[PDB]
Design goal:
The structure is a homodimer of 266-residue chains. By secondary structure, chain A is of the alpha/beta class. The first copy, chain A, is 44% helix and 18% strand. The first copy, chain A, has an eight-stranded mixed beta sheet with strand order 1-2-4-3-5-6-7-8, sandwiched between helices. The interface between A and B is medium-sized, with 17 and 17 residues. The complex binds ligand ZGR (2 copies) and potassium ion (K) (2 copies).
């Protein structure tokens, strides 16, 4: 496993990790921007003959050295532009990409905006609606935000509380700092930026969409409807919002099998 | 409200209830066949200018006096034929119908099989897949089945434990007796009878489909995909499998608004 940093001319100094040799697979974090959530799965995926790259997101975790514009008023299109910049810097010319949540919005924006660069995209639980209870956290003090959101993650959406806790002290210390950055920068601007206003733009694209099997139906009901309208492959992963944390082996297998499916079609 | 019994030529003695004056709305129970679950909603719906009819299902609750054929090897098409028989007996020529679970399968079979008789159908959480853990209960002793399924209803699918328990001792005593009848007669034969093989047969039909907002996505994921493929209205009700129990006011409002929509479209 390579663990290193790289600076892109948009002002971001990224923390990134890479393992393996073969076709490129890129794992984009969810909104919390913390790539140690992929630790187990990176090794499992790489062992099947892929070069796997992941990174902390701008302003989050070890990628905190970044201009304010990269972690405020954040949109899918902004994040896609940042991910392309690190792929450029790492000389990754063609990639399979995974993303959940804001990361899902990001990888759909990548596929649509950079079709020559993206082999296929896997998106999971893509937020398309403003949720006032999340948006309203942006006006609380930092410690309040961290307390509230740490609880929501553990108890409401982790899909596996033991696995979530087992991320460890250092990871949760980084997440503690990320929660206010995410709250102030993401929930009011990510959902309106969802690249799903044109179902016909999605039709025929190499997109595989998932929702968590245990997620309440309401939460990403809209994803299932939109994917089906567009004729996009739509299915389920175990758990809820963090399948790479709750079920890392199943997650790794899904990423490998999906990449292999598109390498055959390619 | 009328509370009475009526016998049909097929050998069933039905317990039925009826309240109100106006266009007919018929509430078909779920597999447990117990129409007291509609008690609150019947009055709320009737008060908006509808004649509302409901009944216990054959072999269940107060409609137990019925031939074994009617509660063994049960299919959507069998249940639809039985519901038509009581509508005939009650001189209900045109009806709006609601059904959940096996009742959902029933109302779609009614709409497709008897289009002259059905104004519109509301289906909720329609089972299309065999579930071994439910099917396998059919070989257990009666009291084992009742204990197991009572627990599943309360803890896994009620969508409101307080409301579920508040059905009261009389209702739960009837359900306790129904669980083995349901287990032996329904889960092995109801899902393969689902009238959803042909999406094109559903297209353009006056069908409104719902799933519970809190239901785990995996439970009726297939409903959302099928409805969307067929261009059928698909949406959510609060709770899980029994919105008429957990949220009777919202349930009543949905039934009234949906019936009104189709009366206009008529
Ligand atoms: C991990 C995740 O990305 C950030 C933590 C929040 C969470 O898990 C709540 C459940 C999923 C909703 C996300 C979401 C919802 C919104 O209404 C707006 C958003 O921008 C996100 C967003 O940016 O992802
Ligand atoms: C209320 C319900 O009608 C009967 C009680 C069981 C329950 O609530 C499990 C959750 C929903 C699955 C139903 C279901 C599932 C199957 O695999 C087969 C069925 O025939 C039903 C069936 O007959 O409905
Ligand atoms: K696993
Ligand atoms: K209610």
């Amino acid at each position: 496993r390579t663990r290193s940093t790289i600076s892109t001319p948009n002002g971001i100094t990224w923390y990134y990790e890479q393992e393996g040799t073969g076709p490129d697979i890129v794992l984009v974090p969810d909104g919390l921007g913390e790539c140690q959530m992929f630790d187990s799965s990176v090794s499992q995926i790489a062992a099947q003959g892929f070069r796997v790259t992941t990174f902390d997101m701008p302003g989050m975790s070890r990628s905190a050295k970044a201009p304010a514009e990269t972690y405020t008023e954040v949109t899918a299109q902004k994040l896609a532009s940042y991910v392309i910049s690190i792929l450029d810097a790492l000389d990754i010319k063609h990639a399979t990409v995974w993303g959940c949540s804001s990361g899902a919005s990001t990888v759909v924006a990548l596929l649509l905006g950079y079709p020559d660069r993206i082999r296929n995209a896997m998106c999971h639980e893509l937020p398309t609606k403003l949720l006032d209870h999340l948006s309203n956290t942006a006006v609380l003090e930092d410690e309040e935000i961290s307390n509230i959101l740490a609880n929501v993650m553990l108890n409401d959406v982790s899909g596996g509380s033991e696995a979530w806790q087992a991320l460890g002290v250092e990871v949760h210390a980084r997440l503690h700092k990320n929660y206010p950055v995410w709250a102030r920068g993401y929930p009011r601007t990510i959902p309106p930026s969802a690249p799903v206003q044109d179902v016909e733009a999605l039709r025929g694209k190499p997109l595989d969409w998932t929702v968590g099997a245990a997620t309440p139906t309401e939460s990403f009901f809209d994803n299932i409807v939109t994917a089906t309208k567009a004729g996009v492959n739509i299915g389920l992963l175990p758990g809820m919002h963090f399948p790479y944390v709750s079920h890392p082996d199943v997650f790794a297998k899904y990423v490998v099998e999906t990449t292999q499916k598109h390498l055959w079609n390619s």
